[PDB]
Design an enzyme around this catalytic site. Structure first.
Site, PDB file in Angstrom:
ATOM      1  N   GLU A  89      18.154  29.046   3.175  1.00 34.78           N
ATOM      2  CA  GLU A  89      17.502  27.889   2.117  1.00 34.78           C
ATOM      3  C   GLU A  89      16.458  27.243   2.684  1.00 34.78           C
ATOM      4  O   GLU A  89      15.116  27.577   1.970  1.00 34.78           O
ATOM      5  CB  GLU A  89      18.741  27.104   1.796  1.00 34.78           C
ATOM      6  N   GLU A 116      26.760  37.809   8.557  1.00 34.95           N
ATOM      7  CA  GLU A 116      25.700  38.653   9.025  1.00 34.95           C
ATOM      8  C   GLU A 116      25.572  38.940  10.421  1.00 34.95           C
ATOM      9  O   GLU A 116      24.878  40.060  10.869  1.00 34.95           O
ATOM     10  CB  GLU A 116      24.142  38.140   8.453  1.00 34.95           C
ATOM     11  N   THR A 123       0.812  -1.103  -0.012  1.00 31.17           N
ATOM     12  CA  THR A 123       0.116   0.138  -0.011  1.00 31.17           C
ATOM     13  C   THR A 123       0.700   1.271  -0.210  1.00 31.17           C
ATOM     14  O   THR A 123       0.834   2.116  -0.757  1.00 31.17           O
ATOM     15  CB  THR A 123      -0.664   0.192   1.331  1.00 31.17           C
ATOM     16  N   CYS A 149      28.333  33.148   7.917  1.00 33.08           N
ATOM     17  CA  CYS A 149      27.847  33.746   6.742  1.00 33.08           C
ATOM     18  C   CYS A 149      27.472  35.272   6.725  1.00 33.08           C
ATOM     19  O   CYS A 149      26.871  35.924   6.043  1.00 33.08           O
ATOM     20  CB  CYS A 149      26.405  33.155   6.653  1.00 33.08           C
ATOM     21  N   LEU A 195      49.722  30.326  23.497  1.00 32.75           N
ATOM     22  CA  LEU A 195      49.313  28.958  23.494  1.00 32.75           C
ATOM     23  C   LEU A 195      48.167  28.656  24.380  1.00 32.75           C
ATOM     24  O   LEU A 195      47.411  28.027  23.962  1.00 32.75           O
ATOM     25  CB  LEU A 195      50.660  28.208  23.825  1.00 32.75           C
ATOM     26  N   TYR A 207      29.703  38.858   1.327  1.00 36.00           N
ATOM     27  CA  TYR A 207      29.731  37.479   1.294  1.00 36.00           C
ATOM     28  C   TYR A 207      30.135  36.983  -0.038  1.00 36.00           C
ATOM     29  O   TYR A 207      31.330  37.331  -0.584  1.00 36.00           O
ATOM     30  CB  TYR A 207      28.306  37.144   1.953  1.00 36.00           C
ATOM     31  N   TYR A 208      29.281  35.868  -0.470  1.00 34.16           N
ATOM     32  CA  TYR A 208      29.760  35.441  -1.723  1.00 34.16           C
ATOM     33  C   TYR A 208      29.995  36.116  -2.784  1.00 34.16           C
ATOM     34  O   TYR A 208      29.647  37.380  -2.639  1.00 34.16           O
ATOM     35  CB  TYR A 208      28.653  34.262  -2.267  1.00 34.16           C
TER      36      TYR A 208
HETATM   37  C1  LIG Z   1      56.126  28.981  23.346  1.00 32.68           C
HETATM   38  C2  LIG Z   1      55.932  29.183  21.682  1.00 32.68           C
HETATM   39  C3  LIG Z   1      54.858  30.111  21.202  1.00 32.68           C
HETATM   40  N1  LIG Z   1      54.827  30.465  19.992  1.00 32.68           N
HETATM   41  C4  LIG Z   1      53.687  31.344  19.739  1.00 32.68           C
HETATM   42  C5  LIG Z   1      52.246  31.083  20.133  1.00 32.68           C
HETATM   43  C6  LIG Z   1      51.523  32.370  20.275  1.00 32.68           C
HETATM   44  O1  LIG Z   1      51.181  33.094  18.949  1.00 32.68           O
HETATM   45  C7  LIG Z   1      52.570  33.172  20.688  1.00 32.68           C
HETATM   46  C8  LIG Z   1      52.775  33.434  22.039  1.00 32.68           C
HETATM   47  O2  LIG Z   1      52.313  31.935  22.836  1.00 32.68           O
HETATM   48  P1  LIG Z   1      53.109  31.891  24.281  1.00 32.68           P
HETATM   49  O3  LIG Z   1      54.492  31.771  24.157  1.00 32.68           O
HETATM   50  O4  LIG Z   1      52.635  30.711  25.020  1.00 32.68           O
HETATM   51  O5  LIG Z   1      52.660  33.001  25.308  1.00 32.68           O
HETATM   52  P2  LIG Z   1      53.465  34.374  25.963  1.00 32.68           P
HETATM   53  O6  LIG Z   1      52.438  35.131  26.860  1.00 32.68           O
HETATM   54  O7  LIG Z   1      54.537  33.560  26.945  1.00 32.68           O
HETATM   55  O8  LIG Z   1      54.092  35.214  24.672  1.00 32.68           O
HETATM   56  P3  LIG Z   1      55.892  35.615  24.925  1.00 32.68           P
HETATM   57  O9  LIG Z   1      56.767  34.287  24.980  1.00 32.68           O
HETATM   58  O10 LIG Z   1      56.028  36.777  24.126  1.00 32.68           O
HETATM   59  O11 LIG Z   1      56.046  36.314  26.486  1.00 32.68           O
HETATM   60  O12 LIG Z   1      54.014  32.579  20.478  1.00 32.68           O
HETATM   61  C9  LIG Z   1      55.220  29.671  19.065  1.00 32.68           C
HETATM   62  O13 LIG Z   1      54.967  29.912  17.774  1.00 32.68           O
HETATM   63  N2  LIG Z   1      56.517  28.784  19.402  1.00 32.68           N
HETATM   64  C10 LIG Z   1      56.622  28.360  20.603  1.00 32.68           C
HETATM   65  O14 LIG Z   1      57.579  27.505  20.854  1.00 32.68           O
END
Ligand SMILES: Cc1cn([C@H]2C[C@H](O)[C@@H](COP(=O)(O)OP(=O)(O)OP(=O)(O)O)O2)c(=O)[nH]c1=O
EC number: 1.17.4.1
Lengths: 733, 4, 13
Positions: free
Chosen positions: A619, A437, A51, A435, A230, A726-727
């Site tokens: 969309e 906005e 059915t 997007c 980091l 945008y696009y």
């Molecule tokens: C430690 C480290 C940081 N970085 C980059 C990650 C972040 O963009 C930036 C800082 O990250 P961090 O070194 O983790 O931060 P911080 O506050 O200690 O900065 P600073 O050393 O100038 O006092 O550096 C690297 O590219 N390689 C590394 O080995």
């Protein structure tokens, strides 16, 4: 002769039952032929035919005749499908009584139990009287497919479908207004229900598919700002993984990450580049996709003066070493007045690492005077590491990549902060969403759970301009729209503390429109000639006025948002006071509403929500309501979509009487008309718009879009105050 | 109203 | 990819 049912027991075919069903469905439609359908489906019938199959066959047959010459097949197919789904869910056409249903669903664990706790048996009985199950007959075939496909509550493994459209709508209402005092609750419930079931207000997918069920995850896009550390990179990345797992679109601001070569810790280590981290943000984003493909979209932002800008711009260019490529993410280049000026004067642009120029990044968004001051100073300062490029080359490279991929986006930061709801000194907007906005303030995290970070959220909805008869109906609609979305913020869950902070702090909303093209077509206007300018000014004045009014009323009733004092609104500043002054030369429509009386009221009682409007693309939402997408003009009179059940066809609303009033996407001679309308809209929109740029190679000598013309359109946009871009559609029949 |  | 600066130069942001 010989059909089999759902219990799998044989009965003979009665071919006049089928006929009646068809006959019923056709009621009121023009140019559909029952015979035609019978012919094409009866031939595929056979002894032992289930059915269910019988329904599929006629549905498909009807659906396959959808055309521009007979658009009512859309509804014939739809009704037949509605009918089938009715039987599929309830076992009969007639839907059970609301209460019984809820009860059963709750016991099966498909609906939230709180519903039975919040509403009494008598209350459900009252709601049942609001419902009009015959509204299901107004859906178009494409819509029904969307409903069946991602909205209705079902068992995806088994394929069982448990509810029907009207129950969805009424229960969405019930949940959003469940905390309202008993003396109003149900009056709102009914009013909302009517609005959404007669397609006046449109709601996003997450809400429609979730609200009423046990889940609490409803946000579709998130905005994360990453710090130059980091610790913050890690946090950011963690957040992304959490949010992409809940199917959310991401918008990342990674402009502060220092440049390759930059010194780390002193002279003990030299930075590696941004690239390596961008790749890490990509993997974060794609962490929950099939393989490393399906789903999870993100858009990354960076300033145009970043020192690595030339390497960032070509991250999507396919032709290149894998090592310097982050192909699966869209990018947004941030530009300001100074940058464009360098281009016009034919000068050079100086590129810097954010880390080496104190106060430059912050000024870029918050204060153009100061930005300029520091930018010039640092240009001369010889100690600062820097690199010069011709303005023309840089721009050319960006436009080139934008054109090639169509995914290199622009964001005019200055416009974003000079004409906004927020005070740039306290809470500047420094990035947008997927997007382009959304424009909200963010603060970087130093850990996933860091309580002092801020993450913005997209709480959306939209008005159907094809469903209102006069602009004064928006008053009510605004009231329901603002009220249901405000209640949702307190209903949904927040995985990361930083997202709850922004949500509760500022309670931001993003309401826009759908069916704009159709609306213009009814009023006999077009996009490209500037005939719609004054109507668009008048329409968007109404929209923003009534949204602000509704928020203000809510503020009196429930109290302004906690961080209301960081808005420009709090200082008595309105959208009409800060818009880009060149708009005055392209439109003379006068203000029809009392903005001064509102100015006071806001100042005095504040606003419940800091932001209210935003014009997003849509969309899915548009399909359910058989409407043109957001503000965009339609590509053709019939839209085609592929599905497992066949080819989906949808005809533009009221083609029969308006085919000639419509202006299709590639009928436009250029981008000027559209760009002006976009700018006029931005005068009142609190946030931003997903504006597109379209080019047709056939209109240019040798089929090649001139660089002179891409920059021309870019500058035009800026001149009329467009915040984002945008696009970039580059037609290829 | 306006918080307090 | 041909760009003319003069034709842009007179533009008024
Ligand atoms: C430690 C480290 C940081 N970085 C980059 C990650 C972040 O963009 C930036 C800082 O990250 P961090 O070194 O983790 O931060 P911080 O506050 O200690 O900065 P600073 O050393 O100038 O006092 O550096 C690297 O590219 N390689 C590394 O080995």
């Amino acid at each position: 002769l010989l059909v089999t049912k759902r219990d799998g027991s044989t009965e003979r075919i009665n071919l006049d039952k089928i006929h009646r069903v068809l006959d019923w469905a056709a009621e009121g439609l023009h140019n559909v032929s029952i015979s035609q359908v019978e012919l094409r489906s009866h031939i595929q019938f056979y002894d032992g035919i289930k059915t269910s199959d019988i329904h599929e066959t006629i549905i498909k047959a009807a659906a396959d005749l959808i055309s521009r010459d007979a658009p009512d097949y859309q509804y014939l197919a739809a009704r037949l499908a509605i009918f089938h789904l009715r039987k599929k869910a309830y076992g009969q056409f007639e839907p059970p009584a609301l209460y019984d249903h809820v009860v059963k669903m709750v016991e099966m664990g498909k609906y939230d139990n709180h519903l039975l706790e919040d509403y009494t048996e008598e209350e459900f009985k009252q709601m049942d009287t609001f419902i009009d199950h015959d509204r299901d007959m107004t859906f178009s075939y494409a819509a029904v497919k969307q409903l069946e496909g991602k909205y209705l509550v079902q068992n995806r493994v088994t394929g069982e479908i448990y509810e029907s459209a009207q129950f969805l709508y009424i229960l969405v209402a019930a949940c959003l207004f469940s905390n309202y005092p008993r003396e109003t609750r149900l009056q709102y419930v009914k009013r909302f229900y009517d609005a959404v079931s007669t397609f006046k207000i449109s709601l996003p997918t997450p809400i429609m598919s979730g609200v009423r069920t046990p889940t609490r995850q409803f946000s579709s896009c998130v905005l994360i700002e990453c710090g130059d550390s980091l610790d913050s990179i890690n946090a950011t990345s963690s957040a992304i993984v959490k949010y992409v797992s809940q199917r959310a679109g991401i918008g990342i601001n990674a402009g502060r990450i220092r440049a390759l070569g930059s010194p780390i810790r002193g002279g003990e280590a030299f930075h590696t580049g941004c690239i390596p981290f961008y790749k890490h943000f990509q993997t974060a984003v794609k962490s929950c996709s099939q393989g490393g493909v399906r789903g999870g979209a993100a858009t990354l932002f960076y300033p145009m003066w970043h020192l690595e800008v030339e390497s960032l711009l070509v991250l999507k260019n396919n032709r290149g070493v894998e090592g310097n490529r982050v192909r699966h993410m869209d990018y947004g280049v941030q530009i300001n007045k100074l940058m464009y000026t360098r281009l016009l004067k034919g000068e050079d642009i100086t590129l810097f690492s954010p880390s080496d120029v104190p106060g430059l990044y912050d000024a870029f968004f918050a204060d153009q005077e100061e930005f300029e001051r520091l930018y010039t100073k640092y240009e001369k300062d010889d100690s600062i590491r820097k690199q010069r490029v011709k303005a023309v080359e840089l721009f050319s490279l960006m436009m080139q990549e934008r054109a090639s991929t169509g995914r290199i986006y622009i964001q005019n930061v200055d416009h974003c902060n000079t004409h906004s709801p927020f005070d740039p000194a306290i809470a500047p907007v420094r990035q947008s969403n997927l997007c382009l906005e959304i424009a909200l303030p963010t603060k970087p995290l130093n850990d996933v759970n860091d309580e002092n970070g801020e993450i913005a959220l997209c709480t959306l909805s939209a008005f159907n301009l094809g469903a209102i008869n006069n602009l004064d109906e928006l008053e009510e609609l605004a009231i329901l729209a603002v009220r249901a979305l405000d209640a949702l913020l307190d209903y949904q869950d927040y995985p990361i503390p930083a997202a709850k902070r922004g949500a509760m702090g500022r309670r931001t909303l993003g309401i826009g429109v759908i069916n704009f093209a159709y609306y213009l077509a009814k009023h006999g206007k077009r996009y490209s000639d500037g005939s719609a300018n004054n109507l668009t000014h008048k329409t968007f004045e109404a929209i923003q006025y009534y949204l602000l009014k509704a928020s203000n009323e809510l503020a009196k009733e429930q109290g302004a948002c906690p961080w209301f004092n960081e808005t420009t609104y709090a200082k008595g500043i309105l959208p009409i006071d800060t818009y880009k002054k060149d708009l005055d030369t392209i439109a003379n429509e006068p203000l029809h509403y009392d903005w001064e009386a509102l100015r006071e009221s806001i100042k005095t009682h504040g606003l419940r929500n800091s932001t209210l409007s935003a014009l997003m693309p849509s969309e899915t939402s548009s399909q359910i309501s058989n409407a043109t997408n957001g503000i965009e003009p339609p590509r053709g009179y019939v839209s085609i979509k592929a599905s497992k059940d066949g080819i989906l066809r949808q005809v533009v609303p009221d083609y029969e009487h308006l085919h000639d009033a419509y202006e299709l996407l590639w009928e436009m001679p250029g981008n000027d008309g559209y760009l002006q309308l976009v700018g006029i809209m931005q005068k009142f929109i609190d946030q931003s718009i997903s504006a597109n740029t379209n080019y047709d190679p056939s209109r240019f000598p040798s089929g090649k879009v001139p660089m002179q013309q891409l920059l021309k359109d870019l500058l035009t946009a800026y001149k009329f105050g467009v915040k984002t871009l945008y696009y970039q559609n580059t037609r290829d029949g | 109203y306006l918080v307090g």
